[PDB]
Amino acid sequence: GRTRVLVELGHYVYTLHYYDPQISLDEAPILEEWLSKINPAGIPPVPF
Amino acid sequence: LRSNVLLMLLQFTLSNLKINKSSTFTSDVTTITSGRMIRAFPELL
Secondary structure, eight states, rough: OOOOOOOSSSSSEEEOOOOTTTTOOOOOHHHHHHHHSOOSOHEEEEEO | OOHHHHHHHHHHHHHHHOOOOOOOOOOSSTTTSSOOOOOOOOOOO
16 A cells, blocks of 8 residues: 556446455456556456 | 778768668557557568
8 A cells, every 4th residue: 555546548448347245355466467468559448 | 091991981872872762651550659650661660
């Protein structure tokens, strides 16, 4: 908890994952898969 | 030295007697230049 980032994208394609709320899970690896497929070509669709 | 330098510039001048010919200009659809009209080529990019 030390840096808050506002990635301003004018419009983007989203995709939401659905979790059972009784499951403890750091979902940083879910976003780190999104952060790996970014190149100057394009962006993978945004995960929630 | 002046006789050998001047003959080196006569090969420098004669080897640059070409015609700058244009080629294809694919627009940069990537986001480094964003829609700019660069010239794609080997790999001189």
